[PDB]
Amino acid sequence: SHSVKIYDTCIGCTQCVRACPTDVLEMIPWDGCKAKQIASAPRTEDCVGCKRCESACPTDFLSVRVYLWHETTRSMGLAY
Amino acid sequence: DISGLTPCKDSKQFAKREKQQIKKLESSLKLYAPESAPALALNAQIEKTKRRFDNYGKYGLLCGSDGLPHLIVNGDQRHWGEFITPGILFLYIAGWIGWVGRSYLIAISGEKKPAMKEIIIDVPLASRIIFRGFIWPVAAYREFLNGDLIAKDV
Amino acid sequence: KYGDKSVYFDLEDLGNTTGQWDVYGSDAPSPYNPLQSKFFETFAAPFTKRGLLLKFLILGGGSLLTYVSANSTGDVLPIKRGPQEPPKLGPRGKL
Amino acid sequence: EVKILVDRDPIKTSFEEWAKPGHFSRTIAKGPDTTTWIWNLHADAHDFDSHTSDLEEISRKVFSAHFGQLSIIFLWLSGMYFHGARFSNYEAWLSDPTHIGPSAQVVWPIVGQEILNGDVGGGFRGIQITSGFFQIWRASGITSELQLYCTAIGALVFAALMLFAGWFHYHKAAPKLAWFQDVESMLNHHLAGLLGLGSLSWAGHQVHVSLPINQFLNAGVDPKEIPLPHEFILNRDLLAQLYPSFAEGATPFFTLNWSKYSEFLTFRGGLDPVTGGLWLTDIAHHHLAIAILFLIAGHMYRTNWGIGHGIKDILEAHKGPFTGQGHKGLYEILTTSWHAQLSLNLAMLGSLTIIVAHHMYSMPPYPYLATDYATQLSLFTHHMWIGGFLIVGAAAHAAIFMVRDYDPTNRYNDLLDRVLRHRDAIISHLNWVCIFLGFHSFGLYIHNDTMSALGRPQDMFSDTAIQLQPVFAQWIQNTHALAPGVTAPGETASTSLTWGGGELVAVGGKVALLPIPLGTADFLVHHIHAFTIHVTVLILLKGVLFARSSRLIPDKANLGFRFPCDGPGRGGTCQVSAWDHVFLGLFWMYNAISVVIFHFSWKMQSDVWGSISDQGVVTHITGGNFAQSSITINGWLRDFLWAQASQVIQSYGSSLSAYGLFFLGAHFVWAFSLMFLFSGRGYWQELIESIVWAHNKLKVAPATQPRALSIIQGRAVGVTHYLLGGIATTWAFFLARIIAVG
Amino acid sequence: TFNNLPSIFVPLVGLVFPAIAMASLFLHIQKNK
Amino acid sequence: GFTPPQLDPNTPSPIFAGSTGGLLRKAQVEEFYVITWNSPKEQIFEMPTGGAAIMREGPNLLKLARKEQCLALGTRLRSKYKITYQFYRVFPNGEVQYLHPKDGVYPEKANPGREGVGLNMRSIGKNVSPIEVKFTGKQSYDL
Amino acid sequence: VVQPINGDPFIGSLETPVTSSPLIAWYLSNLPGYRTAVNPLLRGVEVGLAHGFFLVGPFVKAGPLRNTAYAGSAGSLAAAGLVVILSMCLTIYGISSFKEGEPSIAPSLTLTGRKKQPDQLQTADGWAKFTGGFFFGGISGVTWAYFLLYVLDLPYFVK
Ligand code: CLA
Ligand code: CLA
Ligand code: CLA
Ligand code: CLA
Ligand SMILES: CC1=C(/C=C/C(C)=C/C=C/C(C)=C/C=C/C=C(C)/C=C/C=C(C)/C=C/C2=C(C)CCCC2(C)C)C(C)(C)CCC1
Ligand SMILES: CC1=C(/C=C/C(C)=C/C=C/C(C)=C\C=C\C=C(C)\C=C\C=C(C)\C=C\C2=C(C)CCCC2(C)C)C(C)(C)CCC1
Ligand SMILES: CC1=C(C/C=C(\C)CCC[C@H](C)CCC[C@H](C)CCCC(C)C)C(=O)c2ccccc2C1=O
């Protein structure tokens, strides 16, 4: 559904996923920062698009980035 | 006599506006005694109206067919009291406001937390600057020549 | 098991879990008389092909509508009766 | 049990925190990195539940804030009584109140605004007020301007006293939480002690001061000839000359021989036909009975002694069969939360303001109120608006309870849980009945409009084409007109004359509330009112219930009460917050109260108000064009809006010219509001950043970074400008319309 | 007959062409290949 | 191949008097996201479907409506009650997909064993304009 | 007796007296909307007859020609037209919701937990039989209401 992307300007603060209410994100090891971790987005099918991840990305503009795309029943957040 | 407008000192409908407003204020004047506060205030407003109309007559205002003063902005020397002299009077004050504000923001720019000086206005600083905008048309011109008016990108 | 003490996730019986229930869908047999049922069957089997039913419905309904509106006179709808009144001359002569 | 638990010198009186703005909050007490900070300095200013976590400091803050509000109201009443004393024609209005316009404000002659000082009457140039203070003062037996100045000075004194009281009860000796939580004593006192003794003391004024003075004012006596009020207290012969029951004193009272008090404590219901207001003789007896009732009601709750109902023991006693534990827990969620109490008191106070509006036109309690059509209209409209606003705030604060103070772990309630469980059923049936009412109340107007436009007036829903008569309201009307008799003897007449069997109270040339006939138009507009109320309750109740969770956002409480959205996801989830629900309910309250006051103005001007000549032929202000034109929207546009807005727009060069000025201005402010409600923050931030480039080019970059308004702030600005503009439009339109033709 | 063309085309168009169009378009919506 | 799924058994559900925010027909034809947690005591918690529920001492089980409901519940559990939780996805066919940690560890601790996807090795301004990917399925951000 | 549906608290409904009671559930279970095992044609016949009368009601007395002599006839004609349209929309519904031959999408379970047979109404041919019954019953109920308004005008209200 939605296309979440994490760019290399990350600082590995783990606020994107700790804010993400649908388990879309997960921190993985990395070698590009002092924290040695970066966020990944495997479960984009569960992505609703609420952008709580990028409302908590403390960078110049953003590192995590949500692109609104094909909306399915779970990206639209429907219990019916 | 320009733009098809007769002056107000020799207009008929302007005097008619005068007479009509005076009769309107006199109709509201025959309901009180001529020595009480309402009648005195009405007579004061009446003299205010009459002097107003006579002053608009004596300044050479141009009253159209509707009988109201139509201001000329084109730049006619007779009608610089309409726009150009009060326009300069405006721009002098407006640039005063802008220049004292700009010199204030530049004054607090070298502060640790400048924003608190925009909330809590440093009245001594501004008051020392508040008269520095009296000379804005020359200080701003030099800041434009010296390069201090417009900032550089870096 | 769905019938255990406060267990509602019988993973085998997912119908009872998800709520798939004919809440009032009685499986009781036909309460109608057989003869009138056969009568209705034989007299409504023409309306068994949904596509032919739709074509018949649209075309026959449009035909009946055009027939009613074309054969009806002004007694049943004033638009056909016509003015039956002289026309008023508009403002400024007629313009 | 109950006590005076109060701690001394908790907070220091100092300007040190005045100098540091935003001290109350953590994120705000560090500096304005942005401009939004200042909007957050005012937004959170009175959000004391967010400043602290303990209820003690919050209770002290709101207690002293109430003291500040009372100081403000005492200062406001000081202004009103003073302006009446000095800048008014009240001393002249008493002579000829049916023809002199009550005025209490004069403007300063500077820029031509002295036209506003008009010929109100009484040899006085001012503004025709529509507050009804003059009517109160005639009901309070003032008969002077000295008494008004003394009242203003005393009110200023009480304002200063309340200011000192707030300072004392926050900074010097602030009560702790055990004092506020003793709601038993609070109710025992506010019932018996505020409302009981207050009504008793006003009954004393009504018996000793208002009644004897109005017995002369209504009997053609000039106010200069009337004896002063204290002369009735000092000399009882003058008081007894009109009410001889005072010669016996309190011996009729204490011996229970009250039958010899009916000269001044009456039950002759109806309006005094000499002035159009209710009988003050009935109002004295009223406030007396209310004193007895609130005095016996304020001895209901146990405070310290073995007697009295513990409110926990009342609530826990009520436990429904399939309603669960019932009202258990409510004493702990009402006494440990100010927002719940605020919501409850706001809802009831608002509906009470509306009931005041409704009972102040149909039973005019003050002399020369019903004939001051401007005062009557303005007071009804005012109190209706206040009631709608208070109800909408009750919704907001119910939502704030549900987000913040609601705790099913510690402060549990059963009935609230049961309401949250089937909240979808509540909102579904409300969302249905709103559509049903919308259709069968407004589509009827559309049907009438179309049938009248197709030349089919025999097919409308009118009093001539298709009968939709209010049979139930007609039955209540006819049985309240024939109520004096078997059901309510000893009343001598109906309690009101807004019913078909009543009569006309001719006061001067005016009519003053003859019966109100209910036809099909009243049916249609009353169902429109039910419709608008039901939609407002839909929006507001939905916000309250789904304040915490929905199928869309199940963690809405963690996002807060006042948040814009949770992103464009889920198709978009704008305005899921209860704040945004109440922001919409504001608009729907506006539509509701606007059509309500339109119904009032038109039904009054067409079927009630007017002028009755000495021959008896009453001619109404419009001409009875309500039941024929208020069945279609084009009548409201033509015969109400277009026609009655021929005195606000033609009032240019008149004394009513500020009304047309604010007509256009409130129009403007409403439309300006549409810039906020329609737009979004992102456009304005991008524009602001462009003009910030233009500023940084000239070394005029402000450190308080220019930020476009927050989304919720854009919505707040939109709804407040929208409401202010629509409401000031209506205020100007009503006041000019009703002062001009009067 | 020219005065009777309103009696044929308006009930034809404004009722049947919605029948045909909305039906065929609902079928085109609810389709699978 | 280091953390196996847990395959939730027929555990008891919390004590709850029933609400209207529960499972609609979405569960009857699509997934409905069971959650499982393990309580130290019989305590009371707000349900994401509105209303208060009484969790049971020991393992619990809740089939609420969707992913955000169970994850909001689990975050409230982990923060307020300090309790391990894991939730699933129950398609109507019968399969039970394990989803929340997918590694035995919550998705904040950067624990190795998870491949990075949705990962553009550039700053966010260095994406090509749409004209450079006009008439191509890749929109702007997949190169 | 407001306990949840089938005692299942996490299903969005409740067994309140209005839904699940001996009288109202019985009434909702012995009427042609919920007679699952029986064929849908008789169900649709019953439904159409009832709604044909219910529609002829507010067309004769309430309408454009209610006061005329053409009140009953033209009102019944408009009711038959609305019935034809209702069968029309029912038909597109049966075409759009389920295609030709799939099994029934109705629940195969009941409150007591019995794996009952699915309601063949929800199938294509079943819904088509239901629509045919609805059309036949509705035109028949329209003309029978017209007949009763014709021959038995006096007991009914005119006003
Ligand atoms: C005049 C003497 C005085 C002084 C020096 C203080 C000093 C203080 N008070 Mg106290 N207080 C006073 C009088 C005083 N108070 C009175 C008379 C009351 C009763 C209303 C209170 C009630 C009170 C409360 C309840 C609280 C304080 C608090 C405070 C502290 C912070 C206040 C602040 O920064 O906001 C400064 C605010 C203002 C200058 C303006 C406030 C608005 C005033 C009261 C009324 C406005 C009327 C105006 C006409 C209405 C607007 C309409 C207009 C558009 C026409 C500070 C120690 C706070 C505190 O210590 O908590 C940490 C706190 O919570 N005070
Ligand atoms: C924005 C707030 C606001 C404003 C500006 C006004 C302004 C006005 N009101 Mg309104 N009013 C309001 C809110 C407001 N009211 C609310 C919320 C209520 C509901 C309680 C009322 C009830 C009310 C009544 C009943 C009357 C007014 C009157 C007036 C006018 C004269 C003012 C006055 O004090 O006379 C003096 C005030 C009175 C004579 C009122 C008597 C006291 C009332 C009946 C009860 C006592 C209050 C009680 C202690 C607190 C509530 C208890 C709780 C159980 C509900 C003036 C137009 C009076 C009027 O129009 O006169 C022409 C009038 O008769 N108002
Ligand atoms: C008894 C009455 C009462 C009380 C005690 C409160 C108290 C409170 N309310 Mg509630 N509220 C009320 C009535 C009341 N309100 C009503 C009648 C409404 C309906 C609109 C609301 C709607 C409401 C909402 C929707 C919200 C609150 C919030 C709040 C809290 C903070 C408000 C704040 O800091 O703003 C301080 C004051 C201001 C910011 C000034 C407001 C400016 C107004 C709109 C100016 C324009 C109105 C004016 C009459 C027109 C003249 C214009 C002229 C100046 C040119 C506070 C607990 C907020 C809250 O709890 O947040 C968590 C919140 O979100 N209230
Ligand atoms: C005149 C403008 C207007 C109209 C017509 C509506 C209409 C409606 N609003 Mg909206 N609304 C408006 C302005 C308007 N709103 C504005 C400006 C706001 C800003 C705050 C809102 C905010 C708002 C909220 C927040 C809510 C509504 C709700 C409602 C509904 C209540 C009435 C209803 O369904 O009954 C029936 C419909 C009407 C009365 C509308 C008029 C229709 C006429 C009678 C007949 C139409 C013709 C007919 C069907 C033939 C069709 C012909 C064919 C060719 C198409 C309805 C959808 C509420 C809702 O959805 O729940 C009920 C709700 O909660 N509205
Ligand atoms: C609503 C409102 C208003 C108004 C109000 C009013 C007007 C009120 C009134 C009220 C009142 C009118 C009150 C009163 C009170 C009183 C009191 C509170 C008293 C007390 C007293 C005492 C306490 C005493 C005691 C004693 C004695 C001396 C005798 C015997 C012994 C003893 C000791 C018991 C306004 C508009 C402003 C605004 C809005 C709000
Ligand atoms: C004569 C006249 C006229 C015309 C005129 C014109 C046409 C003009 C133009 C002009 C122009 C075309 C101009 C331009 C300019 C530009 C620019 C570019 C500028 C800049 C500036 C600046 C930058 C400044 C700044 C400042 C100041 C100095 C003030 C305050 C502060 C500040 C800093 C803001 C007319 C006939 C109508 C009328 C009469 C008069
Ligand atoms: C216009 C607009 C804005 C921009 C509105 C701005 C920020 C208000 C303009 C600035 C105000 C007037 C502050 C400037 C005045 C200061 C007090 C500075 C004083 C300077 C002199 C006047 C004394 C939004 O941010 C917005 C957000 C969401 C939905 C709609 C909208 C919207 O419609």
Closest Cα partner for F32 from C20, D94, D588, D124? C20
Tell me the three state secondary structure of residue D170. Answer: helix
Is the CB of residue F57 less than 8 Å from the CB of residue F41?
A: yes
Choose, out of E3, E4, E5, E7, the residue to mutate when testing the contact with C (most C CBs < 10 Å).
Answer: E7
Residues 6+ apart with CB under 8 A from D66: D166
Minimal CA–CA distance to D194: which of D280, D297, D285, D63? D297
Q: Quick count: other Cβ atoms within 10 Å of Cβ F7?
A: 9
Neighbours of F44 (CB within 10 A): 15
Secondary structure tally for chain F: helices H, strands E: 2, 7
Resolution (A): 3.9
Q: Which two tokens stand for residue A67?
A: 């692109």
> DSSP letter string over G130-147?
HHHHHHHHHHHHHHHHHH
Residues of C in contact with E15 (CB under 8 A): 61-62, 65
Q: Do E11 and C65 touch (CB under 8 A)?
A: yes
DSSP state letter for D273: T
C-alpha to C-alpha distances, F136 to A66, F113, F118, F132, F139, nearest whole angstrom? 20, 33, 19, 9, 7
CB D72 within 8 Å of CB D162:
no
The closest of D533, D567, D568, D573 to D550, measured between CA atoms, is D573
Angle at which helices G124-151 and G71-97 cross, to 10°: 170
Considering only the C-alpha atoms of chain D, give the largest distance between any 2 of them, rounded to a whole number of Å. Answer: 91
Give strand pairing partners of G11: F23
Which amino acid is it at D655? S
CA distances from D656 to D25, D100, D114, D375, D562 (A): 47, 16, 12, 15, 41
Residue F113 φ/ψ region, left for φ over 0, alpha for ψ in the -120 to 50 degree band, beta for the rest = left
DSSP code per residue over F24-70: -HHHHHS---EEEEEESS--EEE-TTSSEEEPPSEEEEEE-SSHHHH
Measured CA to CA, the distance from residue D398 to residue D297 in angstroms comes to 27
- CA–CA separation, E16 vs E26, rounded Å? 15
CA D384, D389, D390: angle at the middle one, nearest 5? Answer: 95
Report yes or no: G55 and G79 within 8 Å, Cβ to Cβ: yes
The amino acid sitting at D103 is S
**How far is residue G67's CA from residue G77's CA, in Å, rounded to a whole number?**
16
- Maximum Cα interatomic distance, chain A, rounded to a whole number of Å: 44
Run of H or E residues at D308 = none
Nearest chain D residue to A74, by CA: D570
Backbone break loci in chain E, preceding residues, C–N > 2.5 A: none
Residue D300 tokens read as 């209901």
Estimate the crossing angle of helix G124-151 against helix C50-71, to 10 degrees: 30
DSSP reduced 3-state for D174? strand
The residue of chain E with its CA nearest to that of G88 is E19
Query: Cα D713 from chain centroid?
Result: 25
**Six-digit token string for F104:** 């035995």
Q: How far apart are alpha carbons A76 and A49 in whole angstroms? A: 8
Nearest to D311 by CA among D320, D319, D302: D302
Burial class (CB in 10 A: 0-12, 13-18, 19+), D9: exposed
Q: Is C50 on the interface with G (CB under 8 A)?
A: yes
Q: What element of type H or E holds D56?
A: helix D55-85
Contact of D126 with D118, CB cutoff 8 Å = yes
Provide the edge-to-edge strand list for the sheet that holds D125-128: D103-105, D125-128, D118-119
Sign for the CA dihedral angle at G111, G113, G119, G123 comes to positive
Task: Name the one residue in this structure whose structure tokens are 């305005």.
Answer: D575
The Cα A71–Cα D464 span in angstroms is 55
Residue C47, token pair as written in the block: 């309306």
Beta bridge partners of C26: G35
| Closest among D197, D203, D227 to D214, alpha carbons compared | D227
**Cβ neighbours of residue B144 closer than 8 Å, sequence gap 6 or more:** B150
To test the pocket of ligand 7, the residue of D41, D563, D717, D720 to mutate (highest count of ligand atoms within 8 Å of its CB) is: D717
Determine contact, residues D692/D706, Cβ cutoff 8 Å: yes
The crossing angle, in degrees rounded to 10, of helices D196-205 and D280-297 is: 160
> For chain E, what is the radius of gyration of the CA atoms?
14
Element at A27 (helix H, strand E): strand A26-29
Asked if residues D24 and D45 have their Cβ atoms less than 8 Å apart, the reply is yes
What is the SS3 assignment for D523-587? HHHHHHHHHHHHHHHHHHHHHHHCCCCCCCCCCHHHHCCCCCCCCCCCCCCCCCCHHHHHHHHHH
User: Beta-carbon neighbour count of residue D504 at 10 Å?
Assistant: 16
Shortest alpha-carbon distance between residue G126 and chain D (Å): 31
**Mode of pairing for the β-strands spanning F34-39 and F58-63:** antiparallel
Report the alpha-carbon distance of residue F44 to residue G12 in Å, rounded.
Answer: 21
- A33 in a known ligand binding site: no
Cα D388 to Cα D723: distance, rounded to the nearest angstrom: 12
Closest to D732 (Cα-Cα) out of D672, D671, D665: D665
Query: How do beta strands D6-8 and D173-175 pair?
Result: antiparallel
Q: Is A57 annotated as a binding residue?
A: yes
Angle (CA) G88-G91-G97 rounded to 5° is 140
Rounded Cα gap, residues G38 and G44, in angstroms: 11
Question: Which single residue is written with the structure tokens 């249905």?
Answer: D432
Asked if residue A53 belongs to a known ligand binding site, the reply is yes
Please state, in angstroms and rounded to a whole number, the distance separating the CA atoms of residues G43 and G35: 7
Pairing of strands A3-7, F119-120: parallel
Task: Give ∠ CA C50-C51-C57 in degrees, rounded to 5.
Answer: 85
Touching subunits for chain C (3+ Cβ pairs under 8 A): E, F, G
Q: Distance between CA atoms of D44 and B127, rounded to whole angstroms?
A: 33
The tokens for D722 are 């929208």
Q: How far apart are CA G87 and CA D644, in angstroms?
A: 51
| Alpha helices (H) along A1-80 | 15-19
Nearest to D65 by CA among D399, D338, D336, D352: D338
Which residue do the tokens 């109005």 mark?
D214
Largest Cα–Cα distance of chain E, in whole Å? Answer: 47
3-state secondary structure of A65: strand
Helix (H) or strand (E) holding A26: strand A26-29
Transcribe D381-448 into DSSP letters.
HHHHHHHHHHHHHHHHHHHHIIIII--SSSS--SHHHHHHHTHHHHHHHHHHHHHHHHIIIIIHHHHH
Per-residue HEC secondary structure of D603-653 comes to: HHHHHHCEEECCCCCEEECCCCCHHHHCCCHHHHHHHHHHHHCCCCCCCCC
- Using a CB-CB distance cutoff of 8 angstroms, which residues of chain C are in contact with residue E8? 66, 69-70
Q: At what angle do helices G71-97 and G40-60 cross, to 10 degrees?
A: 140
CA dist., res. A7 & res. A40, Å (int) = 9
d(CA D66, CA D68): 5
Say if strands B62-63 and B6-7 run parallel, antiparallel, or are unpaired.
Answer: antiparallel
Alpha-carbon span D473 to D501, nearest angstrom: 14
Q: Tell me how crowded residue D354 is: count the other CB atoms within 10 A of its CB.
A: 21
Q: CA-CA distance, D11 to C52, in Å (whole number)?
A: 86
Contacts of D549 in chain F (CB under 8 A): 21, 46-50, 72
Taking a contact as any Cβ pair under 8 Å apart, which residues of chain F between 77 and 96 contact chain D?
none
* Nearest CB neighbour to C47, from listed G5, G88, G132: G132
- Kindly state the helix (H) or strand (E) to which residue D103 belongs, with its residue range: strand D103-105
Other C-beta atoms lying within 10 Å of the C-beta of residue G69? 9
* Cα D394 from Cα D349, distance rounded (Å): 10
Other Cβ atoms within 10 Å of D499 Cβ, number: 22
The number of beta carbons lying within 10 Å of the beta carbon of residue E19 is: 18
C-alpha span between B62 and B13 (Å, rounded) = 12
Angstrom distance (rounded) from CA F90 to CA F36:
12
How close does chain F come to C22, measured CA to CA in Å? Answer: 12
Q: Which of F107, F112, F141 sits opposite A3 (nearest CB)?
A: F141
From residue G159, give the alpha-carbon distance in Å to each of D232, D475, G61: 67, 22, 9
Q: Is F98 in contact with F6 (CB distance < 8 Å)?
A: yes
> Comparing C-alpha atoms, which of G63, D75, F82, F65 is closest to residue C19?
F65
Ligand 6: centre distance to CA B121 (Å): 29
In terms of Cβ atoms closer than 10 Å to its own Cβ (0-12, 13-18, 19+), residue G154 is: exposed
As given in the structure block, the two tokens for residue D108 are: 């300063």
Show residues of chain G in contact with E26, CB under 8 Å: 92, 95-96
**SS3 per-residue string spanning chain B:** CHHHCEEHHHCHHHHHHHHHHHHHHHHCCCCCCCCCHHHHHHHHHHHHHHHHHHHHHHCCCEECCCCCEECCCCCCHHHCCCCHHHHHHHHHHHHHHHHHHHHHHHHHHCCCCCHHHHHCCCHHHHHHHHCHHHHHHHHHHHHHHHCCCCCCCC
- Ligand 6 proximity of B139 Cβ (cutoff 6 Å): no
Residue D328 contacts residue D414 (beta carbons within 8 Å) = yes
- Own/partner pairs, D153-157, CB within 8 angstroms, 24+ separation: D153/D78, D155/D74, D155/D75, D155/D77, D155/D78, D155/D81, D156/D74, D156/D75, D156/D78
